[PDB]
Design a protein around this ligand. Structure first.
Ligand SMILES: Nc1ncnc2c1ncn2[C@@H]1O[C@H](COP(=O)(O)OP(=O)(O)O)[C@@H](O)[C@H]1O
Ligand SMILES: Nc1ncnc2c1ncn2[C@@H]1O[C@H](COP(=O)(O)OP(=O)(O)O)[C@@H](O)[C@H]1O
Ligand SMILES: [Mg+2]
Ligand SMILES: [Mg+2]
Ligand SMILES: [Zn+2]
Lengths: 610, 588
DNA sequence: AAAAAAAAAAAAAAAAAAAAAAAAA
DNA sequence: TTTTTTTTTTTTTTTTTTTTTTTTT
């Protein structure tokens, strides 16, 4: 086959990346070093190096991918034959910019059959992983003969009797299976037209991809679109069943996860080892003005404290739960929106938009196998993440009491007669609230300005009252900030048109009169891994502070507690202190972190009553 | 011979004129654009060669095949020179339409089978686009020979594999068979045509390559197709379920000249005045309300800051008044005039909820999104009459949506945030029914938080006037008798759409300064009035009101396509917000 | 705060339309 | 070998009960 030989030669030449930037040679070194047998190749590279090869690969996926994989196996054999001998086949995944192939399940028309398609969609079905045999081995006790039979990928006869009718006992251990799964993906409800029902498509996942995507996750699947046949039969209808044989599955949450950036982070941490936390917090939500303490507290929510697992298996949560009660138009919902945009695995929700079994996980019947199955609820999905609950007050109290366990111990215990489980929900809850009566009556105690019972207020470690004080100077400042924001226009990209349906950022005068959001994201992500240890002086300081906080004297006349001070408060201090330590890469919770958390708690837990 | 008929079709396509050859150039442009389909007007075919049209009406099945082949050959003759990699000629689907009035579904008796039939209806369900094979290849299992290019019939007509090259040794190779789009729809008789006491009849439509997804359920459609029965390997005896082979679909209900027309319309010195007097001419009075509604229609500008946060640019308006004023009429006009608009009541509408809902199909286990008025009205206007009678769930949903523009729903299946970028125009009556000043500020039961959402709140009254009553009655009688500066509905709607898509303005430094000072003074005055009354007026003023004034200024400057909002438009927006502060302050 | 009525969930049963395999001659 | 009747499976809908939720005293 001249065409196939040419394709393989071109692909091998591409993979032979030493004269060029050495990107794919390094990628092959990566895949061999970490012991995986699938390579991911950016299509943009094929377009940049050979447009004919890229077009052929995209328009005729099957044979081109076969040639590419064979060239990949040859190249890995050349670089190392020992590893290359381990795996029968080396697979390939694609990614990049798919000009016209990038579509959704709705736009997926029969025109793309036998082509390469990079679809984006919401996963609806994930079937059980089954081992599909590819090579069977059968042993005959009578004849002592071991017979191997191959099973080509024809996406059938299984031998049982020898030539002279001697029973064959299959050798399961020596047989070769590849794990295989089928999922059903759907077009994102956001981009689907509001009127008609959702449109979906099947996807078939071989090894290395069987469980790369879980139900109810927004994913991008790159693969080949082909037609399935019916079973043997004299008559057939022109109808054909089409699936997307995936070559790569990726989580669209690129936010979920270089030496230059690491060096930048190290230098930024070491430069001023005192006020990095304040500089970050001030830069947390640039569009919003004021609320320095609230921004500080949120910065602690993003970092979070440190979880403690004792020898007895006891669990002490290391996440920080924050509540923001506010008069109308004080940017609490805007802060929740920012947390959604920035914090990874930030699950939004609203008061009555998630009732009972939807907010937390649920249990149903499979309805096909008759077997009970769990249902990842709104918050169990938010494990190791943030849950932004807006309009918290309007929730039915049943839902509220259905959050205490996840808020405190971070696990949801659900059990019906058939099945029982304790799903992991280690999420930090950021709740927004409009105080009873709509607006905050400063001439009433914060206790009666909040309709929540004492226990739930205890659940929240920090409770911020954000009043709509109109101090004319403060109103002038807020108006200046807002109007400057409303005037801002994107640099160069815009010139008076409308919107269709580095450590430090450049200092604009219309936004400043701070640190980059991307740099802030990277620094926060790296800092979140640090695990500081409390110091003896810090422990004594926090203990004394908690002792006074419980003491009546800590509150003067006409000042009331915004929430009861109990054991949790103490942990909050630690957690908050821990958070402040993580901002400085401290690795040791010194006194500065403890006292900063202490002042934060003192500000949060007492309100002056007029 | 059939070759003669195809030759005549070729002549008709190549030489039909109107000078200009419509179909030759249509083939050129469509094939160059890659459409690979055309829309043949039946009357032109009949006029050029009436015999061809009669044949089509009597024997569509093969005459349409001949026409498609002729169109393919003509397209080759007109666009043969192509770059390497696409020179292979492409078959062409030939949709056909006509001006003939449709025949009622009740007249589709047995005789009309296999004839070309034109019927009206309402599509109540559409299946997903799928694959049907036009050319299949079968390979023998024993001899492994191939019988490539087995012509496949269109429509719901399967095919039987050969028995003799064992017996029945052939299997289909999926990788070698060419298929095309495919879709099945359910067409119900139009409810108007259904007899009084009578069930609505039904029919099954079958689309094809480019007819798939040209309609969505709920469309009022006229279908021209081939009345055909299923052909699947052959007390009711010998009954073959019947269906229509869809060939032509017509869904019932901007040129550069119009772009320049809009440009000159905006340039008029009094464009604002002509627009203000050109929304509810039948309704008498309420000039300020009409100006505010125009501002709402044009909307402000959506801003996304570098941090990613979004500032809504859609104005929200509320109108509290006695039940006498023409405000529901105003909402009906607004929904009829906005480019995208929906009218609904507080408790949703008739079998059409207000806010979106998500449910999982227990059988298919999908995530069905039943769209409420808000999500359907994305990018447009939602006119909520009886806005004070919502349900708690809907009250919270709109509470979130009017500010964030998004409805966040998390069910046992998934979490999601539907995008509802709708401008809310709400109408309502007082709590008691008639606005009585003696209980001023107690005539509204809305919680203070909701009232913050609305950019402007208008208060209407009819407490007393004789001259106004006489003028109103005489004007209504004059309107019913009759039954210039008025931009017609279509022109106004297209102008609104063009302005919204094209022009997004921003404030200027001086305008921002003036608005800042004015807002500071308004806040001071409101605070002082609240202190004097020793109570909190249930109509607050917040930074959200500053955003509202900015949005109104942006809409005023967007009317004129001016990139920057000047001082005069900010002053006008301040006056408009003053006509609602008349309820914020003068009410108490 | 607790009971009465309503609504929704969920699970089990039925129709049924169509494709494939085993038994019969 | 070739038909035929069954077998399934794969969707979809429908009905009863229970549970969950909403409104009233
Ligand atoms: N301190 C502030 N700084 C910047 N913007 C603000 C501030 N207070 C209010 N706003 C503006 O007012 C609007 C109200 O935001 P939102 O949080 O949705 O209302 P609420 O606080 O009542 O939930 C936001 O769009 C925000 O831009
Ligand atoms: N200013 C007005 N100009 C013209 N017609 C009016 C005016 N005010 C009331 N009407 C008429 O009175 C009727 C009542 O109006 P409607 O909008 O139904 O009141 P509501 O909104 O309270 O239901 C309408 O049919 C309208 O034609
Ligand atoms: Mg809010
Ligand atoms: Mg009305
Ligand atoms: Zn043969």
């Amino acid at each position: 086959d001249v065409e196939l030989r040419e394709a393989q030669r071109d692909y091998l030449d591409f993979l032979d990346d030493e004269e060029d930037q050495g990107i794919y040679q390094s990628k092959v070194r990566e895949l061999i070093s970490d012991n995986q047998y699938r390579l991911i190749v950016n299509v943009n590279d094929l377009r940049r190096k050979n447009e004919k090869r890229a077009n052929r690969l995209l328009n005729n996926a099957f044979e081109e991918l076969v040639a590419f994989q064979r060239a990949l196996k040859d190249f890995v054999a050349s670089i190392d034959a020992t590893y290359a001998k381990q795996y029968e086949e080396f697979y390939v995944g694609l990614e990049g910019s798919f000009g016209s192939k990038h579509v959704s399940p709705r736009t997926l028309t029969s025109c793309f059959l036998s082509c390469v398609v990079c679809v984006e969609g919401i996963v609806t079905k994930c079937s059980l992983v089954r081992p599909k045999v590819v090579r069977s081995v059968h042993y005959c006790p009578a004849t002592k003969k071991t017979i191997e039979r191959r099973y080509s990928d024809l996406t059938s006869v299984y031998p049982t009797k020898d030539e002279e009718n001697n029973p064959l006992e299959t050798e399961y251990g020596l047989s070769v299976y590849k794990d295989h799964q089928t999922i059903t993906i759907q077009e994102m409800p956001e981009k689907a037209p509001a009127g008609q029902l959702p449109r979906s498509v099947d996807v078939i996942l071989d090894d290395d991809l069987v469980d790369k995507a879980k139900p109810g996750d927004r994913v991008q699947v790159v693969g080949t679109y082909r037609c399935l046949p019916g079973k043997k039969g004299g008559y057939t209808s022109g109808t054909f069943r089409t699936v997307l044989i995936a070559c790569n599955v990726k989580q669209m949450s690129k936010d979920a996860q270089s030496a230059e950036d690491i060096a930048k982070i190290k230098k930024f941490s070491k430069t001023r080892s005192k006020d990095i936390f304040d500089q970050l917090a001030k830069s947390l939500a640039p569009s919003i003005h004021g609320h320095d303490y609230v921004k500080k507290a949120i910065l602690c929510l993003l970092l979070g404290g440190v979880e403690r697992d004792l020898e007895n298996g006891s669990h002490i949560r290391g996440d920080i739960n924050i509540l923001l009660i506010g008069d109308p138009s004080v940017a609490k919902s805007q802060l929740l929106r920012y947390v959604l945009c920035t914090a990874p695995r930030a699950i939004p929700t609203t008061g009555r938009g998630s009732s009972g079994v939807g907010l937390t996980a649920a249990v149903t019947t499979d309805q096909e196998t008759g077997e009970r199955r769990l249902e990842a609820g709104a918050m169990v999905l938010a494990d190791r993440g943030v849950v932004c609950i807006d309009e918290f007050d309007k929730m039915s109290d049943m839902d509220r009491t259905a959050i205490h366990e996840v808020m405190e111990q971070g696990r949801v215990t659900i059990a019906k007669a058939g099945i029982h489980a304790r799903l992991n929900a280690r999420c930090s809850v950021l709740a927004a609230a409009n105080p009873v009566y709509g607006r905050y009556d400063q001439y009433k105690t914060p206790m009666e300005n909040i309709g929540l019972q004492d226990s739930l207020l205890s659940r929240f470690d920090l409770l911020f009252i954000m009043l709509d004080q109109m101090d004319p100077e403060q109103d002038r400042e807020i108006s200046d900030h807002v109007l400057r924001m409303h005037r801002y226009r994107a640099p160069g990209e815009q010139d008076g048109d409308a919107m269709p349906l580095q450590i430090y950022e450049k200092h604009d005068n219309l936004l400043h009169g701070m640190v980059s959001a991307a740099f802030m994201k990277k620094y926060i992500h790296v800092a979140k891994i640090i695990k500081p240890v409390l110091t003896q002086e810090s422990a004594t300081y926090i203990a004394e502070e908690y002792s006074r906080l419980r003491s009546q004297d800590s509150m003067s006349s006409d000042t009331a507690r915004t929430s009861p001070v109990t054991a949790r408060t103490l942990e909050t201090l630690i957690r908050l202190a821990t958070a402040h330590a993580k901002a400085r890469m401290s690795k040791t919770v010194d006194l500065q972190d403890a006292e900063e958390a202490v002042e934060l708690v003192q500000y949060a837990y007492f309100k002056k009553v007029l | 011979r059939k070759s003669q008929l195809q030759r005549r079709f070729k002549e008709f396509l190549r030489q039909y004129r109107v000078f200009t050859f419509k179909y030759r150039d249509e083939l050129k442009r469509h094939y160059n654009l890659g459409e690979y389909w055309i829309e043949v007007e039946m009357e032109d075919l009949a006029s050029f060669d009436e015999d061809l049209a009669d044949y089509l009406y009597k024997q569509p099945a093969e005459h349409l095949q001949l026409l498609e082949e002729a169109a393919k050959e003509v397209a080759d003759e007109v666009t043969r020179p192509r770059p390497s990699g696409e020179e292979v000629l492409q078959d062409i689907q030939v949709m056909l339409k006509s001006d003939a009035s449709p025949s009622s579904i009740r007249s589709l008796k047995s005789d009309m089978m296999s004839h070309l039939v034109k019927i009206p209806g309402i599509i109540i369900a559409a299946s997903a686009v799928r694959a049907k094979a036009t050319r299949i290849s079968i390979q023998c299992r024993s001899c492994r020979n191939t019988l490539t290019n087995i012509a496949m019939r269109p429509g719901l007509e399967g095919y039987a594999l050969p028995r003799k090259c064992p017996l029945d040794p052939y299997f289909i190779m999926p990788d070698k068979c060419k298929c095309v789009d495919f879709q099945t729809l359910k067409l119900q008789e139009l409810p108007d045509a259904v007899p009084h006491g009578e069930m609505p009849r039904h029919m099954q439509l079958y689309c094809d390559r480019y007819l798939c997804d040209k309609v969505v359920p709920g469309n009022r459609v006229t279908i021209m197709g081939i009345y055909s029965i299923k052909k699947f390997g052959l007390v009711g005896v010998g009954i073959r379920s019947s269906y229509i082979r869809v060939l032509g679909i017509q869904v019932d209900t901007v040129s550069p000249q119009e772009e320049e027309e809009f440009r000159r319309l905006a340039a008029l010195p009094n464009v604002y005045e002509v627009i203000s007097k050109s929304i509810a001419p039948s309704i008498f009075g309420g000039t300020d309300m009409k100006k505010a509604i125009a501002c709402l229609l044009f909307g402000g500008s959506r801003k996304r800051l570098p941090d990613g946060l979004t500032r809504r640019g859609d104005i929200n308006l509320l109108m509290l008044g006695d039940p006498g004023t023409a405000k529901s009429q105003l909402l009906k006009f607004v929904e009829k005039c906005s480019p995208i608009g929906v009218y609904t009541s507080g408790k949703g509408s008739s079998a059409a909820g207000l806010t979106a809902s998500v449910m999982r199909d227990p059988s298919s286990r999908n995530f069905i999104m039943e769209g409420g008025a808000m999500v359907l009205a994305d990018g447009g206007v939602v006119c909520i009459d009886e806005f004070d009678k919502m349900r708690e769930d809907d009250r919270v949903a709109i509470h979130e949506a009017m500010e964030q523009q998004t409805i966040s729903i998390a069910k046992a299946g998934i979490t999601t945030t539907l995008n509802s970028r709708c401008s809310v125009l709400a109408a309502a009556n007082s709590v008691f029914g008639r606005w009585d000043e003696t209980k001023g500020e107690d005539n509204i039961d809305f919680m203070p938080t909701i009232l913050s959402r609305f950019d402007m709140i208008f208060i209407v009254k009819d407490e007393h006037n004789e001259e106004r009553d006489v003028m109103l009655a005489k004007h209504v009688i004059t309107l019913h008798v009759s039954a210039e500066g008025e931009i017609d509905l279509a022109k106004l709607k297209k102008f609104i759409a063009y302005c919204r898509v094209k022009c997004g303005p921003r404030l200027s430094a001086e305008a921002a300064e003036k608005l800042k000072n004015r807002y500071i003074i308004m806040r001071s005055g409101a605070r002082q009035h609240e202190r004097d009354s020793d109570r909190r007026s249930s109509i607050p003023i917040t930074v959200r009101q500053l955003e509202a004034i900015v949005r109104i200024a942006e809409a005023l400057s967007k009317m004129k396509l001016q990139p920057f909002a000047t001082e005069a438009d900010v002053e006008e927006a301040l006056r408009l917000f003053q006509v609602s502060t008349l309820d914020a302050a003068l009410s108490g």
